[PDB]
Amino acid sequence: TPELEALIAEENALRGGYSTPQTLANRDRCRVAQLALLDGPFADLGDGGCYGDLFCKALKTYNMLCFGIYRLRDAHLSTPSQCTKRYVITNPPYEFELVPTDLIFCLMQFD
Amino acid sequence: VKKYDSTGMFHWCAPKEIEKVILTRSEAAMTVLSGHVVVCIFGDVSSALIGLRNLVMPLRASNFHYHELKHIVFVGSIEYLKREWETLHNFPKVSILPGTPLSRADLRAVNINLCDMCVILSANQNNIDDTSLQDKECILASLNIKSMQFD
Amino acid sequence: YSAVSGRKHIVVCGHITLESVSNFLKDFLHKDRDDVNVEIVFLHNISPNLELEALFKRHFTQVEFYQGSVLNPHDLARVKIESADACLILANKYCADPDAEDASNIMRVISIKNYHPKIRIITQMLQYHNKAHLLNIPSWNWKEGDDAICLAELKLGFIAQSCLAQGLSTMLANLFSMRSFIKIEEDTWQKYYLEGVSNEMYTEYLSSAFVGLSFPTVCELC
Ligand SMILES: [Mg+2]
Structure with missing residues (x-):
């Protein structure tokens, strides 16, 4: 933020301060986090496989923005294995199929 | 009490140890300096020694009333200044603040916006043979003061 | 150079070499962008070699070269910098000593701003503390477009963010390399990843219909 930009020019460091109600209002920023579909409110959709449905539901319910899938490498093979490497899929189309062993990036709210 | 010089040519005082004039950033804030002269140097250990006596001496001449003198404040590396401190100890009204001239906080700690002059010097200008990088420090430091903002 | 009415142009100077120029041009003139009509005017003080000359010949209609030094006001007038829309600077990432590179780049910035105080500059920096010096130049207005890219800061930040959630570094880094869609029919992991990588990021003003909504x-309904 510009306030940090200006202050960092003067001292090139940071100074401890005192909390004020207006200052504490700056602690409201969305952060990055990962979710698991194995359990939770979305465990029902883990096998359903409709990316869009989760997207609309998540945003309306918790104001969560989900924009990626971090899928197991060999989840698309009929034969089983035990490799636990995963790759990234960015902005999947609306009609995408899901599996319970999937992780999705999200943007948490604050508190 | 000895006030002038042996030859009756300059103001004189008893020698003083170096620690009695070193100031800190907070400490210099309380002191109010007006119409003074601030001098910035870029020396350090193992560098050519410019003779600062020739600079301070004309300021502290005779035919100047004691109240008419100009306060002098150095800004730079304390290691460099200690090498030539003995030559300048006899001169009155001299103060040293350790710091870097690029640090915009220091130039605010001393009231640079109320000054009569601001000298900038270099030390290792002969040592470096890189023409492009020669005088980078003095050029950059001068521009810094240009962009300063005051209330 | 001879300015052509109704057409912008930019000026590129710094560490000009074969691979750097090839990468920059390939990324710049990609088809996924909108229609573009900007000429690129390089500026260097070393005569190019045969490979580089061949590259310029290949991009004949939209690249021009001029030998000179960016520290000379005559050269700066030669490449018509007053009407230039922006000026770029490229840095040598694999240098032996980082500090010398930063000093050279700062000197270049000072010279350009001296010749003209309203141009827009984009640069690269190798260390964070050196970036602080650019805030002291009198005409470095970062509120408008004047951007310094600190490689070290961005790299460490990407890694640190990856600590919270893995894969974030890759997912972000693929949003800035303009790529066209690639289709592969055999079923492996690479298919979906290649479908994903084709995306980029764009900015645009909103329509008037959204002024009063939440x-x-x-974010829905779009
Ligand atoms: Mg042409």
């Missing part, structure tokens, strides 16, 4: 509502 942010989640407009």
Whole structure:
């Protein structure tokens, strides 16, 4: 933020301060986090496989923005294995199929 | 009490140890300096020694009333200044603040916006043979003061 | 150079070499962008070699070269910098000593700003503390477009963010390399990843219909 930009020019460091109600209002920023579909409110959709449905539901319910899938490498093979490497899929189309062993990036709210 | 010089040519005082004039950033804030002269140097250990006596001496001449003198404040590396401190100890009204001239906080700690002059010097200008990088420090430091903002 | 009415142009100077120029041009003139009509005018004080000359010949209609030094006001007038829309600077990432590179780049910035105080500059920096010096130049207005890219800061930040959630570094880094869609029919992991990588990021003003609505509502319905 510009306030940090200006202050960092003067001292090139940071100074401890005192909390004020207006200052504490700056602690409201969305952060990055990962979710698991194995359990939770979305465990029902883990096998359903409709990316869009989760997207609309998540945003309306918790104001969560989900924009990626971090899928197991060999989840698309009929034969089983035990490799636990995963790759990234960015902005999947609306009609995408899901599996319970999937992780999705999200943007948490604050508190 | 000895006030002038042996030859009756300059103001004189008893020698003083170096620690009695070193100031800190907070400490210099309380002191109010007006119409003074601030001098910035870029020396350090193992560098050519410019003779600062020739600079301070004309300021502290005779035919100047004691109240008419100009306060002098150095800004730079304390290691460099200690090498030539003995030559300048006899001169009155001299103060040293350790710091870097690029640090915009220091130039605010001393009231640079109320000054009569601001000298900038270099030390290792002969040592470096890189023409492009020669005088980078003095050029950059001068521009810094240009962009300063005051209330 | 001879300015052509009704057409912008930019000026590129710094560490000009074969691979750097090839990468920059390939990324710049990609088809996924909108229609573009900007000429690129390089500026260097070393005569190019045969490979580089061949590259310029290949991009004949939209690249021009001029030998000179960026520290000379005559050269700066030669490449017509007053009407130039922006000026770029490229840095040598694999240098032996980082500090010398930063000093050279700062000197270049000072010279350009001296010749003209309103141009827009984009640069690269190798260390964070050196970036602080650019805030002291009198005409470095970062509120408008004047951007310094600190490689070290961005790299460490990407890694640190990856600590919270893995894969974030890759997912972000693929949003800035303009790539066209690639289709592969055999079923492996690479297929979906290649479908994903084709995306990029764009900015645009909103339509008037969304003025009064709420942010989640407009994030939906789009
Ligand atoms: Mg042409």
